[PDB]
């Protein structure tokens with residue numbers, strides 16, 4: 454089982470254990486004894502596998518030094534809260550010393566046993582539930598189910614093998630639960646597969662999660678937040694979304710470089726379904742959504758609001774200085790046997806940055822002339838890479854800017870009116 458560890462004291466040469474109603478260091482360390490096996494769980498609690506309880510100290514009426522004890526993990530009136538960085542020091546401190554220990558005949562770092570990592574090595578990570586009745590809320594670890602404590606996900610209580618967790622600490626009381634995410638290359642359960650491609654989709658209509666939690670939820674399933682890379686993809690999504698009413702997080706965000714738009718996965722931004730007046734509120738709303746209200750259009754929203762979200766996975770997978778309009782800046786490339794330049798890589802971008810361009814604006818082969826905000830190279834190559842300018846493409850004011858420039862020093866692009874007279878670059 455992952456994330457279970459023994460706690461080894463170098464000073465006292467032994468492992469922490471819980472047994473017989475005591476907490477103590479035993480010189481015989483055994484990785485297979487439940488009394489010696491610990492796990493970090495939620496709310497900074499340290500769970501013992503053999504006792505099924507959490508390490509703590511009390512609040513007695515006698516206001517005096519504390520000692521270690523084991524407690525039912527739902528008793529949060531007590532001090533059940535530790536911190537992995539200071540835990541070793543506090544174990545030593547609270548273990549104390551008997552007079553026998555400091556008066557012997559003849560006149561201490563703690564670590565995971567084995568690997569010898571620090572006690573922060575195996576932190577607890579929240580696990581967002583899938584479907585269930587909990588709207589995606591993380592597992593409550595540990596939880597009680599049929600009078601037993603579980604320190605992780607379990608198939609107990611189900612016949613179908615699917616691992617699940619409670620989303621409170623007592624399922625019998627509350628009956629709130631969800632499935633645990635699984636990493637797999639199959640799309641059969643909790644997924645839908647586009648059969649025309651390798652893509653699998655999960656529309657979690659009933660979940661309410663922040664964009665970051667939704668990102669993590671898709672990550673824990675071996676997937677990523679939806680990226681819409683192609684008119685084909687937006688078409689499938691629109692078909693699937695017909696008849697629903699929902700607003701869902703997708704992988705689009707400007708978070709890193711303000712205004713720089715990107716998929717959370719690495720897909721190029723060659724396709725934009727922004728709604729009419731969106732993006733608005735640039736410093737405010739940093740994360741994209743898709744909405745049925747707009748027949749599949751995209752808005753940006755404050756990333757902390759709780760929304761449903763879509764997960765996706767694909768398991769089976771020289772210059773011309775003469776100023777002219779973009780249009781037949783291409784004609785000048787075609788005659789001469791070439792085409793306006795396409796860029797498939799950041800190196801090919803830098804290949805062209807200082808070398809060919811040599812200090813300002815100029816045309817490349819990227820254009821949306823055929824379908825608005827679906828960008829293609831004029832030389833017909835795959836659009837596998839894009840370097841845009843924050844807020845671009847735009848269509849400044851409401852006006853068609855159907856052709857792309859290199860405006861700026863470092864090679865980032867912009868969509869501008871195709872009749873602006875500018876230099877160009879060709880390739881063959």
Ligand SMILES: *[C@@H]1O[C@H](CO)[C@@H](O)[C@H](O)[C@H]1NC(C)=O
Nearest residue numbers: 480481482483484485486487
């Ligand atoms: C750990 O306990 C098992 C009994 O379950 C025993 O067979 C084994 O030898 C023990 N390991 C050590 C190092 O004492």
Ligand SMILES: [Ca+2]
Nearest residue numbers: 733738752753
């Ligand atoms: Ca908005």
Ligand SMILES: [Ca+2]
Nearest residue numbers: 821853854855
């Ligand atoms: Ca355009």
Ligand SMILES: [Ca+2]
Nearest residue numbers: 847848868869
């Ligand atoms: Ca523009």
